Amino acid sequence: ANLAPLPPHVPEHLVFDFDMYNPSNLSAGVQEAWAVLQESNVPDLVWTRCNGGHWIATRGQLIREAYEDYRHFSSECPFIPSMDPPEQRQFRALANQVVGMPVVDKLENRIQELACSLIESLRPQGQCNFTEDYAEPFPIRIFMLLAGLPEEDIPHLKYLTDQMTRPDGSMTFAEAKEALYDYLIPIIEQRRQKPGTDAISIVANGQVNGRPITSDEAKRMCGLLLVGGLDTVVNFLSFSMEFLAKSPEHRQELIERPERIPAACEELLRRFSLVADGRILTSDYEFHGVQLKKGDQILLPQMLSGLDERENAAPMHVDFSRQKVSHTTFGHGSHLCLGQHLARREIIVTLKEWLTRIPDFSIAPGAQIQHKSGIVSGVQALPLVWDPATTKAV
Ligand code: HEM
Numbered sequence: 001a002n003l004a005p006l007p008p009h010v011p012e013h014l015v016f017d018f019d020m021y022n023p024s025n026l027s028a029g030v031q032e033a034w035a036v037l038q039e040s041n042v043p044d045l046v047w048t049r050c051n052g053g054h055w056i057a058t059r060g061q062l063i064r065e066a067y068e069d070y071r072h073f074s075s076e077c078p079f080i081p082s083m084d085p086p087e088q089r090q091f092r093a094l095a096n097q098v099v100g101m102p103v104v105d106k107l108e109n110r111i112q113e114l115a116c117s118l119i120e121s122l123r124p125q126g127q128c129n130f131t132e133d134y135a136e137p138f139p140i141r142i143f144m145l146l147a148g149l150p151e152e153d154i155p156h157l158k159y160l161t162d163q164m165t166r167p168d169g170s171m172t173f174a175e176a177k178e179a180l181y182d183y184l185i186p187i188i189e190q191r192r193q194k195p196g197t198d199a200i201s202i203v204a205n206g207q208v209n210g211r212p213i214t215s216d217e218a219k220r221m222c223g224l225l226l227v228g229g230l231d232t233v234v235n236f237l238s239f240s241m242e243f244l245a246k247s248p249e250h251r252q253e254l255i256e257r258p259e260r261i262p263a264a265c266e267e268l269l270r271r272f273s274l275v276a277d278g279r280i281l282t283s284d285y286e287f288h289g290v291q292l293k294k295g296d297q298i299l300l301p302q303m304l305s306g307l308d309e310r311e312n313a314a315p316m317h318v319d320f321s322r323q324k325v326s327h328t329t330f331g332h333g334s335h336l337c338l339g340q341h342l343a344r345r346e347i348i349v350t351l352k353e354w355l356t357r358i359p360d361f362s363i364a365p366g367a368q369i370q371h372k373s374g375i376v377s378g379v380q381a382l383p384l385v386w387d388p389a390t391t392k393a394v
C-alpha cells in the first residue's frame with residue numbers, strides 16, 4: 001500500500017501510518033483529520049511508513065522543542081519526501097526590510113484599498129467563489145504593489161505559481177521555477193542600477209557577508225518572498241471565510257465588536273492552522289526517550305500545536321475571547337514566518353472590509369466544501385452567496 005519498510009532502529013509500537021497528503025478522515029475537515037494524531041492512543045512521537053517513512057511529532061511541546069533545536073533538526077531538507085543560522089540571519093534581516101512590522105504599518109491602507117476594490121466588485125453579484133475571486137487576487141495584488149510590478153503581469157505570475165502547487169501538466173516544477181527566475185532576473189538587474197523603494201530594489205541592493213548580494217541570491221530571495229505569501233494566505237483566508245459563512249453568530253460578534261477583530265484573527269490562525277513542514281536529523285539523537293537516527297526526516301506540523309488540547313481547551317471550538325491563544329501557525333524558531341505581520345494585517349483588513357460590505361453571507365446551497373492536505377493544506381473552492389440588498393456600498 002505505498003509503505004516504506006520500517007527502519008530497524010524504529011520500534012513497532014511507535015508506528016502509525018498517517019499519510020500527510022491523503023489522511024483518512026478528510027471529509028470531516030483537514031484540521032479534524034490531522035487531529036486523529038492527537039487521540040490518546042497515539043504517542044507524542046510516531047513513525048509513519050507513508051511518503052518514504054518519517055517521524056511525526058504530534059504535540060505542541062515536541063513540535064516547539066524540535067523547531068528550537070536547529071542543531072539536531074536541520075532545515076536543509078524541510079519537505080517530505082534550506083539554510084540554518086548565521087547566513088540565514090543575514091537573509092532574514094534583509095527580508096525584514098521588505099515585510100517587517102514598520103513596512104506593514106506604512107502599507108496597511110494600500111492593503112485595505114485593494115481589499116475594498118475587490119470586495120466592492122463582487123458585492124452586487126450576490127455570489128462568488130471566494131478562493132478564486134478574492135483569496136488568490138488579494139495577496140498577488142499586494143505582492144505586485146510591494147514589488148513595483150505592473151498589473152498586466154498578474155496572470156502570468158499567478159500561472160507560474162499555480163504550476164508549483166497544482167500543475168495542470170504544462171510545465172515541470174523545475175520549468176515553473178526557472179520561468180519565475182527568468183522573469184525576476186532582469187528586473188533585479190535593472191533595479192540594482194536604478195533602484196526605487198519597492199521590494200525588489202531593496203533586495204537587489206542588500207549586502208551578504210561584506211559584499212553585494214548576487215543575482216542568484218537575490219532571485220532566490222525574491223522568489224521565496226513571492227511564493228511564501230501566496231498559497232498560505234489563499235488557503236488560510238478560505239478556511240477562515242468558510243468558517244464565518246457557516247457561523248452567523250461569529251459574523252454577528254465581529255460586526256457588534258469590531259475591536260475584537262485582531263483577537264479573532266489570532267484565534268482563526270490557531271483553529272485553521274494549515275502548514276506542516278519538516279526537518280532532517282543532523283546526527284543520531286535521543287529525543288524524549290526515542291532514538292532518532294542521522295538522516296531521518298521528521299514532520300513537525302505547525303498546524304497541530306494549537307489544536308493540542310494540552311495547549312488550548314476545547315481546541316475545535318472557535319472562541320475569539322480566549323485569554324491565551326497558543327499556536328505555532330507561523331512556525332517557531334529560527335525560520336518563524338517573515339511574513340507573520342503582513343499576513344495578520346491581510347487577515348484583519350479582510351475581516352473588517354468583508355463584514356462591513358457583505359455582513360451576511362453563506363455557503364452556496366448544496367455545495368459541500370472539500371479540503372486538500374499536504375505541506376500547505378487548503379480549500380479546493382469556496383462558493384459563497386448573499387442577498388445584495390443586505391450589503392453596504394460604503
Ligand atoms: C496566513 C499566512 C501565512 C502562514 C500561515 C505562514 C506560515 C509560515 C511558516 C509555518 C513558516 C515556517 C516554515 C518552517 O519553519 O519550515 C513560514 C516561513 C516563511 N514565510 Fe510565511 N506564512 C504566511 C504568510 C506569509 C507571507 C504573507 C509572506 C510574505 C512574503 C511569507 C513569507 C515567508 C518566508 C519568506 C518564510 C521563510 C522564513 C525562513 O525560512 O527564515 N509568509 N511561513
Ligand SMILES: CC1(C)[C@@H]2CC[C@@]1(C)C(=O)C2
Nearest residue numbers: 227228229275277375376
Ligand atoms: C510555509 C512557507 C512559506 C515556507 C517557505 C515556503 C512555504 C510555503 C513552506 O512550505 C515553507
